[PDB]
Amino acid sequence: NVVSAPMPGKVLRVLVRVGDRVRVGQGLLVLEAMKMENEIPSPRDGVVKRILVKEGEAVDTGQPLIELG
Amino acid sequence: MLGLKTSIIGRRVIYFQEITSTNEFAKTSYLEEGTVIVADKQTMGHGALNRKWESPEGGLWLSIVLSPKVPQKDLPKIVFLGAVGVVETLKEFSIDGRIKWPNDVLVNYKKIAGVLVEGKGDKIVLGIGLNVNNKVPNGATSMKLELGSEVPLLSVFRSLITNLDRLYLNFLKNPMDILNLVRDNMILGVRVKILGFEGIAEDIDDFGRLIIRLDSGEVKKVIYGDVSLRFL
Numbered sequence: 001n002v003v004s005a006p007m008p009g010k011v012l013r014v015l016v017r018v019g020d021r022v023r024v025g026q027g028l029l030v031l032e033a034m035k036m037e038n039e040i041p042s043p044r045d046g047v048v049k050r051i052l053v054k055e056g057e058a059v060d061t062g063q064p065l066i067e068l069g
Numbered sequence: 070m071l072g073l074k075t076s077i078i079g080r081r082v083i084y085f086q087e088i089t090s091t092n093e094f095a096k097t098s099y100l101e102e103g104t105v106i107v108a109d110k111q112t113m114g115h116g117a118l119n120r121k122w123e124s125p126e127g128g129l130w131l132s133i134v135l136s137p138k139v140p141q142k143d144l145p146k147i148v149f150l151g152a153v154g155v156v157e158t159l160k161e162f163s164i165d166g167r168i169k170w171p172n173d174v175l176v177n178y179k180k181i182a183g184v185l186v187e188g189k190g191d192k193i194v195l196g197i198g199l200n201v202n203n204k205v206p207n208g209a210t211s212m213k214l215e216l217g218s219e220v221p222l223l224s225v226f227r228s229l230i231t232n233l234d235r236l237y238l239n240f241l242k243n244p245m246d247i248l249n250l251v252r253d254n255m256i257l258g259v260r261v262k263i264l265g266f267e268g269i270a271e272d273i274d275d276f277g278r279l280i281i282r283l284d285s286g287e288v289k290k291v292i293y294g295d296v297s298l299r300f301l
C-alpha cells in the first residue's frame with residue numbers, strides 16, 4: 001500500500017532504501033514538523049517498492065510518501 | 070541513590086558508560102513516561118537538522134521520554150521546555166544563559182547547550198546536551214569554563230531534571246506559560262538575515278515562530294526548518 005503524510009513537514013531524511021524490506025512500525029523517513037524531527041512508521045511489513053518523495057521536500061498531510069511491496 | 074524527588078520526569082533514570090545516542094535508544098525502546106537516558110559519553114551524538122553533536126566525557130547528555138497528549142499546536146513548545154529548563158539550572162549555578170531561537174542556550178553568545186526533540190508516534194523524545202566539564206568546540210563554552218572550575222556532574226543533573234519536571238507539569242496545566250518564559254529569556258534586538266530578507270529578531274508567536282521586523286517596519290514570521298538564518 002501507500003504511506004501518506006501524518007502531518008505537514010519538510011523531509012529531513014529517508015531511513016530506508018528501495019527494495020528494502022520494511023518492518024511494521026519501523027522508521028521510513030523523517031519530517032521536521034512543529035519543532036520536532038518526526039519519524040514516520042510503516043503501517044505494515046513489506047518492501048520499499050517506491051520512495052515517492054525527496055529530502056528537503058515539503059509534504060502535506062496525506063501526501064503520498066512510500067509505496068511498499 | 071540519586072535522591073530525586075519528581076512526579077513524572079526522573080522517576081527512572083537509565084545510565085550508560087557510553088552509547089551511540091541517548092535519543093536513539095529512547096526512541097527504539099519501550100519506556101514509561103518520564104524515564105531519563107543519560108550517558109557519560111555518546112559517540113553518534115545527534116543535533117537538530119541532521120547536524121552532529123560532540124558528546125565528550127564530563128558533560129551532561131540525556132533524553133527524556135514524554136507523553137503529553139497535547140494538540141499539535143502545542144508540540145512546538147516542547148523544545149522550549151528543555152531550553153528554559155537549562156536556563157533555570159544555569160541560573161542556580163549563577164550563570165546567565167539566554168535563548169537562541171529556538172533550541173540553543175548561550176552564555177555571552179557562546180553555545181553551552183542545545184535541544185533536539187524527536188517524534189515517534191505516541192512517543193515524544195526530549196534530548197538535551199549541556200556542557201559541564203567536557204572539552205568543547207571552538208566558539209562554544211562550558212560551566213567549567215564559565216565558572217573556572219569543576220562542576221559536580223550529578224548536582225547539575227538533579228537540578229536540571231528537577232526544573233524540567235516542574236516545567237512539564239505546568240505545561241500540562243497551561244502550555245502557554247512556557248512561551249512567556251521563553252520570550253523573557255531569549256536573545257532579542259539582533260539583526261538577522263534570512264537566506265534563499267533581513268530584519269530584527271523582536272519576538273515569537275503562540276506557535277513559537279520567530280518574528281522578524283524588516284527595515285520598512287513590516288513583519289515576517291519564520292517556521293523552524295523552512296529557512297536558513299544567521300546573526301549579523
Ligand SMILES: Nc1ncnc2c1ncn2[C@@H]1O[C@H](CO)[C@@H](O)[C@H]1O
Pocket residue numbers: 116117120121122123124125180181182183200205206209210
Ligand atoms: N558539544 C558541543 N558544544 C557546543 N556546540 C556544539 C557541540 N557539538 C556541536 N556543536 C555545534 O552546534 C551546531 C549545531 O546545533 C553545530 O554547528 C556545531 O558546531
Ligand SMILES: O=C(O)CCCC[C@@H]1SC[C@@H]2NC(=O)N[C@@H]21
Pocket residue numbers: 089090091092093111113114115116117120122124129130131132172173182183184185196197198199
Ligand atoms: O543544538 C543542537 O543541535 C541539539 C543538540 C542536542 C544534543 C543532545 S545530547 C543528548 C541527546 N542525544 C543526542 O543524540 N542528541 C541530544
